[PDB]
């Protein structure tokens, strides 16, 4: 149900706590968190505290079960 999501690209390493229903796709949690941090949702990705990448196309319940509460947003900068 609850995640602490940290923004890695800001030196203050700010974080947001989000309570979510277990059935919510985690893609919507990511978006919601990116919006709270005012970074672009579309290009954000999510990793764990060990620095393991997560595919956010799964339920919040399953993300919680496999990885726990402590997740980290990284930018995936798209231009070149």
């Amino acid at each position: 149900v609850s995640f602490k999501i940290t923004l890695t690209s800001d030196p203050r390493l700010p974080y947001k706590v989000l309570s979510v229903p277990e059935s919510t796709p985690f893609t919507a949690v990511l978006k919601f968190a990116a919006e709270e941090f005012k970074v672009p949702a579309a290009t954000s990705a999510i990793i764990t505290n060990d620095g393991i990448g997560i595919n956010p196309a799964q339920t919040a319940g399953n993300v919680f079960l496999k990885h726990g509460s402590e997740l980290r947003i990284i930018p995936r900068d798209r231009v070149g």
């Binding site: 956010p56 196309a57 900068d77 070149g80």
Partner: protein, 239 residues
């Protein structure tokens, strides 16, 4: 050192980041550059004309095609595998300096299948941010290990010069540290230009990555790891 002349580097995307990166490696005396981009001349041909004038001793192989189409994908893999400094040998590194996720995913797919080490680079739309990332397939995170929301969610993709120069510079520096074995190679180095914050990380592979070749590379990696003062006149004392 002149070890640099023995290496070949493929660069995909010769826009802002890749053009600077190609120039830095050309000036360094890289043995060979392979340039891939897709659009009078083509961007890769223009880039080749500029670079050849800068250093005539660098070899160039350029390809004006979209690597994401089915025919060109096989030719792309062929050239990563055989287009090194010696024909029949792979390139030493691929660099991604493309402007879209589709092409990053194609490069990723090719590199995971081939076991080819590559660096990824990017810049944000608003020039506020960028990064570089080292993907050694199986050992560090591939690009599909932590997909951005749009890749994961299957949505179709539908000040800049300064940020590009920083990212290209740190990219090349990582290339030289990697090829020449000096300093510490970053697995990940971000750049936040608003606050001058440059975070390093080393992201590990996702054991359930969507790329099945990433998974197999992870298996092979784990296996491989499992196989093993001229004067001191003033009496200054170090306490």
């Amino acid at each position: 050192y002149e070890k640099i002349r023995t290496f070949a580097v493929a660069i995909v995307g010769v826009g802002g980041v890749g053009s600077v990166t190609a120039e830095m490696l050309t000036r360094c005396g890289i043995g060979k550059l392979l340039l891939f981009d897709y659009d009078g001349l083509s961007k890769v041909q223009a880039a080749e004309h500029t670079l050849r004038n800068i250093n005539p001793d660098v070899l160039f192989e350029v390809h004006n095609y979209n690597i994401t189409t089915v025919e060109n994908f096989q030719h792309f893999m062929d050239r990563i595998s055989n287009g090194g400094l010696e024909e029949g040998k792979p390139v030493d590194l691929v660099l991604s300096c493309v402007d879209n996720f589709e092409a990053r995913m194609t490069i990723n797919t090719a590199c995971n299948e081939l076991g080819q080490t590559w660096m990824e680079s990017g810049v944000s739309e608003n020039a506020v941010s960028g990064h570089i990332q080292l993907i050694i397939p199986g050992e560090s995170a591939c690009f599909a290990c932590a997909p951005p929301l749009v890749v994961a969610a299957n949505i179709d993709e539908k000040s800049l010069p300064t940020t590009m120069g920083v990212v290209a510079g740190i990219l090349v520096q990582n290339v030289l540290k990697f090829l020449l074995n000096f300093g510490t190679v970053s697995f990940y180095l971000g750049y936040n230009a608003m606050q001058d914050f440059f975070p390093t990380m080393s992201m590990k592979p996702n054991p359930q990555c969507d790329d099945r070749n990433c998974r197999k590379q992870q298996e092979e990696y784990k296996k491989k790891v499992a196989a093993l003062h001229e004067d001191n006149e003033w009496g200054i004392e170090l306490v």
